[PDB]
Amino acid sequence: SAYLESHRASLVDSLRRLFGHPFGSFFTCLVMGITLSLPMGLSLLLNNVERLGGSWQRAAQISLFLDLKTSENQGQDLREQIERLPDVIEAQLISREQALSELQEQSGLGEALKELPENPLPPVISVTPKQIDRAGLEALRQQLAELPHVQQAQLDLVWVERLSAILKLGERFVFGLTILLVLTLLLVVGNTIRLHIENRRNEIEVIKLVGGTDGYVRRPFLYMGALYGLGAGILSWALLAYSLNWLNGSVVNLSGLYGSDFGLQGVPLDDGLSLTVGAVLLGWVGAWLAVARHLRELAPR
Amino acid sequence: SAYLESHRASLVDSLRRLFGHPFGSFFTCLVMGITLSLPMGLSLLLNNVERLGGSWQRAAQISLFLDLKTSENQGQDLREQIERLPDVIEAQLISREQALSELQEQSGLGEALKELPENPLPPVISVTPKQIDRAGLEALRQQLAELPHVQQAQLDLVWVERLSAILKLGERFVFGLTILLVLTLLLVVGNTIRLHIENRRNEIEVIKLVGGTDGYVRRPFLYMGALYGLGAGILSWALLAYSLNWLNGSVVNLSGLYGSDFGLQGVPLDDGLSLTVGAVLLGWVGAWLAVARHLRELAPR
Amino acid sequence: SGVQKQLKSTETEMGDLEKQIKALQDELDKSEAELKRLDGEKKKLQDARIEQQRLLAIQARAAYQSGREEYLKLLLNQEHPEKFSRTLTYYDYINKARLEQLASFNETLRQLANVEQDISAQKAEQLSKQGELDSRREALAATRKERQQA
Amino acid sequence: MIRFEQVGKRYPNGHVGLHEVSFRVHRGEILFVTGHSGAGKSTLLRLILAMERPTSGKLLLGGQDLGRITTAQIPFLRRQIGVVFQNHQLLTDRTVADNIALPLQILGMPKPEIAKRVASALERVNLKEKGEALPSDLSTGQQQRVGIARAIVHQPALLLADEPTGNLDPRLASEIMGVFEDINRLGTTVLIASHDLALIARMRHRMLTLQRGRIIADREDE
Amino acid sequence: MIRFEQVGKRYPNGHVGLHEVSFRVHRGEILFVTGHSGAGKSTLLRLILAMERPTSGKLLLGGQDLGRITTAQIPFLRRQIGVVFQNHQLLTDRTVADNIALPLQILGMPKPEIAKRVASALERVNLKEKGEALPSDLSTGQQQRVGIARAIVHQPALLLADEPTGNLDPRLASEIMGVFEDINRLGTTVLIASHDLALIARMRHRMLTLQRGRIIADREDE
């Protein structure tokens, strides 16, 4: 119909009110921006750290040392069969000549078999699982102990149990911190929007006293909430990038010392769009809750 | 004279305003408290880590690999000689028999020393310095090279560095996080009080239009700020005391897995008292600035 | 002819016995040559099993020198701690393989014990043959007496 | 068509309130209700606007049971009853031209003629040449005239009033009385209330007297 | 004992309100200046209370130059000059009995004295009941009455009023005029001001004229 005039009037009124006394609006926008930037920054840092997830795993691999007499084709066959297990990531096959050099490098003793007729080092393989725990690893070792050609399985149980604890400690910390940050953001946005809505009461009273309707009294507050959300999103998206750029000056040195490039790249445009959309939606929901409270308080009873 | 009467009237008015609206003025009291948990938190966590000073040290230990044939009393004498020399913390000697026991504890390298006539294993000494740097520790190793009964020093220079670099990243991260949390705490505390104060820009005008002393218009707002500060402090104390108890359910397990017993201790009573006073002082400061804006634009002009 | 012919017959018998006596010195020389041959073999065999202590000491020192590593400084230094646990069982295999080498040295020691008990038996035989030469020495003393009558 | 049939309302904690008040059907003529206004008589006015549901009794003004009314359809009723209260409230920080003629925007009309309609409406009242000043800094009495004119800009089928010219200049009361009579000429039910005997003795009233929450007696054209 | 010596204030952008006006006022008499609020009468009223300084000229009120006055000395002056403006301003959500006793609470005085002074002020303003009633939810004029009373509870040496009458029944305004004359009798200077020519001849008083921001002359009982 011809109700677009309502939207036009609401939007121009919201812009006029927002552009008056700029500092009051700017401080609120900046507070919401920082409060939203915190959890988003944590999530982005976690995602960036996730790129190197292969190093955390593959640390406690179960050895499946074979017998001294083994056909090479049989070795590849057992490699393929172990690869078929649903609970294994990767399989390998180290050779005797490679094993000798591996022992020589770490041992530092150099010459080993001075007066020994033949090499007794048997062919060896490696197996890596998805998850690390004291029970699943023991169960998988028991499963692998009855293969056609296996004689030992040297898993260091004292270490594998420590690895499970040293990884579970990190998970709970992140979980609790995420919960706390989300709660803080929700409370801050809700309270700020509630205060701004409570500032205007006589308007609602007069509009409801005269013949009105819910939409015609609710629209301007929705527009104001949307504008505050967009402002907070823009402010937040222009500060997290600077923080990541400042922090990137130190991580590159450590990455170079390890001998690799792990530059902290941040704020892709998709993430910025998601952030601003989320801020707008949060403001829009907060405004609709705040208006609904006052509207319910004026029930005829 | 009349000071006490007005002061009591202001206190009673503030209490009536605070308790007059249950289910309201409590979300404010909770948001002003939870946002105080974040910056006051991570300070107890940092203190608890700093208490555990044996992990940052004793991680890059120079191994003074002593000669094969040396009398035990002479080795002990070298022990206190190193102990008194600076740039160290503790020096300990390991007996040959204890060395054999440690080597025999592993499944490998056993059931063969009995055939061997005597122990070839020489005593060792561990030395823990204070500073962790490439040049200083290299000079320390060079100075410890020239001793009458030392064979070789065993330390990895690539590991001497690459450890002073991981610490720097943590320091910079902690510094940035502290700055970011302090700024958001201050901004939230200021903004919420500003929003509450602005809703009463009619009492100030009437009080000033009639003859009114400067402190008479400021006192009730100061009380309103102080009460909110106290409530936020109490809530922050409770939330920290619960969250740290939640967290302490896993770190004790990891500490017990190794040979030690370390656990996160709860909030000390002195620290708790210092927390609930550090939140009251935001009142009488936030209020003293929120009312200072209306008090300067209503001045003659 | 009693002085001449009877003494000549005894001298001829003494010479016939002396032929086998020279033969037994010859076999004695052969036995002594093989005795020092076996003695040198035992000495060179006892030269072995000394490299046993040498190599065992080297491996023990190497194991102690790299057998003390907190695993948290292995993962953080790109030492790929997948190893340092395989090489523990590699050391177990090399210690059982050096135990097989030492079992070859136990073959050495048992062969030495056997080639010491039986070689002591050939020293008993050596005493017996010294005794039988002691029996086979009065022939020259007799020949000295019956030389005059010839 | 204002109809009452033994209505009675009681505050849960305030006081005892009103009891068993009834009237008959009517259309397009003046009808006083004020009688004696020793106690707060705004309860009836509030009850008309469906702001507070009655405690007891039944009533209907357009064939609708006000006792059973839903919040969804309540504002479709309050859209055609111009109402002026005693302690009138106005939208501060908004121009008087936009403050008045507010119901027109809810009703929905093209913008250009709203200006001429509101100009005629404000010209009907003696106030003029102050169509842009804020409600603040405006002299009292003129702003209550603005509040009165808020309920007259459009064309309502019913009009209400609490206490016009309760303490105003009696000379100025003639203008608003003429305005009420003129809007009655087109046909508008009026339930004006007041407390001045000399004025209420005129304009051919049909008043009723209420006291202690109940109708006392009938004073037909005194 | 106020003295005006060529005082005229200029808006930065709006217009000219006052221009070099000057007149003298003694202590024990009442002065009744006429003019127009939109022509600068309200600005002149605000000028005494030191809310805005004059742009040109010099000003004297009791022997102090209001052009250069410290901001820490204004409260020591404004607490002895009662004032009522044309439009009322009241403390919402504070009861009338408490809201009417602001000057006494500021001055500092035991509570029973405050109570009896307020009680004595209520019969002077002629309000008996609704003492504990809210400032809102009240009929018009009553707010203006309590605005009058706020300037009567204490004993100010000088009091200023702006159009206290002109829009009410004259018999009602008789009480306001009487209480103003009574507080004048005690020895309080009064500078009541209005633009109604009828009130000029009702009582004898040295009036003054103002138009277009300029003064013509001073006439006694025009």
PDB file of C-alpha atoms in Angstrom, chain A residues 252-260, chain B residues 159 162 166, chain C residues 75-78:
ATOM      1  CA  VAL A 252      56.919 -14.307  12.543  1.00  0.00           C
ATOM      2  CA  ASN A 253      60.228 -14.413  14.445  1.00  0.00           C
ATOM      3  CA  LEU A 254      59.353 -17.699  16.161  1.00  0.00           C
ATOM      4  CA  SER A 255      58.048 -19.126  12.884  1.00  0.00           C
ATOM      5  CA  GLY A 256      61.338 -18.228  11.213  1.00  0.00           C
ATOM      6  CA  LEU A 257      63.306 -19.844  14.029  1.00  0.00           C
ATOM      7  CA  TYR A 258      61.370 -23.058  13.452  1.00  0.00           C
ATOM      8  CA  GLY A 259      62.027 -22.511   9.738  1.00  0.00           C
ATOM      9  CA  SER A 260      58.568 -21.871   8.305  1.00  0.00           C
TER      10      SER A 260
ATOM     11  CA  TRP B 159      67.329 -24.921  22.384  1.00  0.00           C
ATOM     12  CA  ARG B 162      63.995 -20.555  20.656  1.00  0.00           C
ATOM     13  CA  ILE B 166      58.391 -18.345  23.084  1.00  0.00           C
TER      14      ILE B 166
ATOM     15  CA  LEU C  75      57.900 -32.061  20.837  1.00  0.00           C
ATOM     16  CA  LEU C  76      58.738 -28.355  21.166  1.00  0.00           C
ATOM     17  CA  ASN C  77      62.144 -28.678  19.446  1.00  0.00           C
ATOM     18  CA  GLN C  78      60.994 -30.457  16.242  1.00  0.00           C
TER      19      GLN C  78
END
